[model samples]
Target: MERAEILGVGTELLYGETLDTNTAEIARSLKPYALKVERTLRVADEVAPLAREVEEAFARARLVVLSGGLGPTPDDVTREAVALALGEPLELDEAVLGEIEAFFRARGRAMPEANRKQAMRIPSATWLKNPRGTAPGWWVRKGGKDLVLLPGPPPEWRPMWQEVLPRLGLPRRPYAERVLKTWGIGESEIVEVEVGTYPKVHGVEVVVRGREDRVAELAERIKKKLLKEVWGEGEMTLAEAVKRRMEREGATLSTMESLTGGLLGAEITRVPGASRFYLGGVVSYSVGAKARFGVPQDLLSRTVSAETARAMAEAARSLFGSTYALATTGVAGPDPLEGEPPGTVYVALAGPTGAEVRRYRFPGDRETVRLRSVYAALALLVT
Candidate 1:
């Protein structure tokens, strides 16, 4: 398998002014070739730093694909950096200059002298024609290593890659991944399990534990397990999975949150087409709010009881006119509530079938407990 690295060249990307969609697009484009993107590097548009990163990428990967820094601006230094890394001098090409001039002429304008540098190519490189932009791509090889330099803009880079990649004659391999999202389980608890022992016929990356680690590993395991509890993995989020489930079953969902503070609603709305099955949600952070939402005065009086949780879920369903509703009530730590311990939480899920409530004694600080409670509530809904 050919190992690839993505180098996004721009100081704006490093400073967060511009997002790096190029890397994602490149990865997706390379998928058909079964290229493994080992790492992605974001570097400032400085020749020395960019050259250092390119050298590192070339050392680690057989193919190094870079995006950005190909525009006719002073900040665009990708070509210069690649030339520096390969110890080659930039030489102007007459054919590229003619193409650049033609681009401006066709639009009834004269090309700027600065744009002439877009025609520069290393002697050892093959110019990849970019019909979308004046700055054509570069395909260079040095010591059996490959370097692909694409324009910064997505419109230009995407099509340029499609035309160039096929000519590279790269290998064909399967790219498979899995993801599992668990709400009630702690990261440590999930990571402690021996997932490496799981069987795999193809090469896979298994990551579990910590917030970042869990995000990747959970996706992988869920893809493998395919249990009722497992939602869509890979790049899919929990909200997307829930939306898919609702669409498949032709069910709609509502939510009532107390301690979570509208986070439940935020999660549901994260899906692009959530309105198809998401009726809505209500955040009743206080006893008065819960009562106004028809939580049943008796149930609110019992506070942490399973009855209150069930009532909250049913009330949410009735208020939003949905087939399914999820509710959460808890004493998020640092203090006790209604004589119950600080970490006590109640979660309920009501569907057309019936209502089920669960009580949990979570352990953590206030914010951690609240976040965990929200996840637990979602997990119940997912299962």
Candidate 2:
């Protein structure tokens, strides 16, 4: 594995005003490419100090990658610092400037004078195209050391990193990765794997990596070990997995939400082709709204109960004329409601077989509780 260091630049990072997600992203992405992240650090937007760190990183590792400080503002000084560190001059590229101006022009805005700095390039560096933003990245080679400077924002940085990965000329083997996402499974239940395990909001993810055959073998072992718990694989969300299953099974679905508002519907529709299998939903939050959605007035009196959740799902399944429906009703707050504490949630799924409702007392504040409720409803549908 070729050694590399990640430097995140921005004064806001030092102040804890902005998160330094770029370093983690870089390190994770580099692993498959067989580039080992030897060290990682954050530096504020001072040209001298930032330049010093760049030099020091190069001394320790062959590749030094940096993110942030490539914006149009005065404090965005990664470009100059990198040039100074490499004993190179920052010269303007007319073609690059034209591209930047065209970006602003396409958006119906004039290019700011400050943005002209983004087109400056050092003699030893090549431009890394950033189609998502105004800041183009730099891949510089000076002496035997290599450096890459990327934009600060994740949206811009991610695509640019993907583009540059293939060109990083390092000694690496043919590599592949498989991500197994499981729900209703604890991290401790998972057996050891060579790559890693990540505990996430919805479930535990086991990232398996190696050559193609090796990756497949490891992934299959995990799947067999936790066959019932694995919801989906690489890049598939709980909602997307549900969508795929429902579509294949020729089933349609709907929802009615209270504690999660319309969050259940929101997560479902995030899948690209949700319209085919999802019949839509209603956010029947208030007692009157629940009654209007065909929840009996008696049931409305205890809105957060499992009976209410089941009634809501049954009503939605009938209203939308779908094969299955899910409902969420709960208290998500700092205070209790109807003798129920915060995070007391009931998620129900109604299908041809029958209605199934699960009660949960989740942790965290309002948003976290709501999010958990939404995912739990989907998980019920998945199972």
Candidate 3:
């Protein structure tokens, strides 16, 4: 495995004004190329500290990559820092300078003189083209070390990486990665490590590195050990888990809401292409609306109960002809609804077998209770 270090260059990253997405992007891009991102770093656009980290990274890893600070402003000092770190002098590339000038002139505008820095190249560096921006990328190689500099904007950075990284002569081997994400598991109960309790992250990330077959073997065992906690793998949400099962079964789901008010529907449609399995739902907020949706007006009581929730779910399933239906009815409020306390909600599921309703008194504010209802609905629907 080849180790790599990523440097995210921006003052905003340190101040939490912007997230350093470049590090994650580069690491995911490097995965198939047999490069392991061992460490990620963030540094402002200053030469002294940035160059020091660059030199230190070069000593430890063959590949050192950087993102951001490649603009024309004075604060965009990535070029100077790279040159200083490698003990090389910067020289202007006339062809690159001509392109930079032409880029602005073609737009019927003048190029700023500061943009001249964008055309500078070091002796050991090859310029990587960026069709989307004035700033280009750098691939410098010497002393068995490789350093790559990429731009900040995602549009330019993403495509430039697609063009540049594959040409860097990296090995490709079959590998397996499984991210078993879960909810409702505490850290102390898992691996005996005391990190967080319930209602928090209270989770674990299972990362295994090995041959494809061995990795799968280890992943299966790990999953079995944590079966109760396992939900889905690799950025899968509860809604996604349910949607996928529905897709496999050629089943569709619908929702009707009195309290969650389209939030459960939003969660379902949050997954793109949801129309395949999610028939549109109704936010039956009032007595008339529930009646219009075919839920008996007699069942639309202000003192919402499991019976009301069950009726709503069945009505929605019938309306859309979906295989399953979900419904939420509750009081999510700073003030009580129908004399009932807040966080009092009923999540109901109607499926082929029969109808089941679960009453939950989740202890939280309005938004929190509503969000948890969506999660609870999806979990029940999937299982």
Candidate 4:
């Protein structure tokens, strides 16, 4: 497989004000090309940094695909950065300028002079027509290297990539990647003995990449070994899997939260089309809040116990009119809670059958404990 890198350029992305979906989109589009994106680089919307990143990226990878910064704004300097990196002179493409102006004219908008910058293309580059937006992408090929610049927004970026990438005739090879997303097991205590010969963990996401059969073998072995603990694979997440399981069973789920605050509900809704399976949740923090959800005051008195967890889950199922409900009541603290340590978590699931609960003593600080509690709650829902 040909080695390559992806770059996402924007000040908003650097500051976390905007998410970098352009690079991700490119990665999905690249799978068919058989271009292996080895690295992803995020650069601020500045000329020097952007050019330096491009130079270094091209050095390591034969192909570098960049997204964003192809706009009219002052900080939109991806074209300049690419030209500088490859030692090519930039020039205005009159055709691109005419098309951009006509697009604005069709919409009855004035052609701002600032937008002319988007019409610039380098001498060694070809302009890829962007039908959905004003910016026409640049495709450059020189010597042994290839670089593509795509517009930032999805509407324009998606269509241009679809039309242009295939026609460019990139190198191809058959390869695959599989992820066995596990929970409860810490990174160190991970089942390395099973993945023995294969590589270790990557951000708690166990992945293996190579020939299609090899990757599938590793994923299947890990999935069987971990069983229900293998929360998901590929883009599958715990929430998505849980939602799908609920959908398969012709049921819906709700949450009653304590230690996890609204995190349990937040994760549940992160999956698109969540409303069909998720009935929403109640963050019953205090004793009164738990009581309001139909949990007895007596149950809240013995907080963070299985009784409380079960009560809350049962109350949530009744209140939300959901077929199944999950609850998280735990001690995630800098200090002790009810004389118990920080990682004491109780996850509960209330279904038509009965209330099932589990107590976990996970090891982590506040955030980690709460996250584990949510994971445990979802696990209970499915299994």
TM-score on alpha carbons, each prediction: 0.58, 0.89, 0.66, 0.72
- Writing each residue's lDDT as its tens digit, candidate 3 over 158-179 gives 8878887777777787765666
Where is the poorest 10-residue window by lDDT in model 2? 186-195
lDDT of 2 by residue, 186-235 (tens): 77767542667898767788888878778888789878987888888888
Report every candidate's CA lDDT. 0.78, 0.87, 0.82, 0.81
Point to the candidate with the largest TM-score: 2
Backbone steric clashes in candidate 4, count: 0
Cand. 2 TM to true fold: 0.89
Instruction: Give RMSD (Å) of candidate 4 vs. truth.
Output: 5.6
- How many residue pairs collide in each prediction? 8, 0, 0, 0
Model 1 lDDT tens row, 297-327: 7777677778888999999999998989999
Best by lDDT: 2
Listed per candidate, the RMSD to the true structure in angstroms reads 8.7, 2.8, 5.9, 5.6
lDDT minimum window of 10 residues, candidate 4: 193-202
